[PDB]
Amino acid sequence: AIITPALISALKTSFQKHFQDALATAPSTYLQVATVIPSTTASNTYGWLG
Amino acid sequence: AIITPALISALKTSFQKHFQDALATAPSTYLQVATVIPSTTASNTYGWLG
């Protein structure tokens, strides 16, 4: 047996990173409800006509 | 920074013709419930013989 097993508890443990990054964000959805037409300015106003 | 960015606000603005005539008239349906019989006069009267 071990008279003082406390000092070996660290070595009697295994570390598995199976829970690391085992998740993801929800699937992209703005494509179906929105479209992207970017610009190079800060405002990008649309002066359309009737 | 700029003391009066409002004057130079045009630098930070863009005008893309994106919201431009992005509509279409409702699909034609007169053909379904009507027929075209044009003439070259001002009245185009019709008659019958019972």
TrEMBL record, chains A, B:
Superkingdom of source: Viruses
Q: What is this protein called?
A: Bacteriophage Mu GpT domain-containing protein
Organism the protein comes from: Pseudomonas phage JBD30
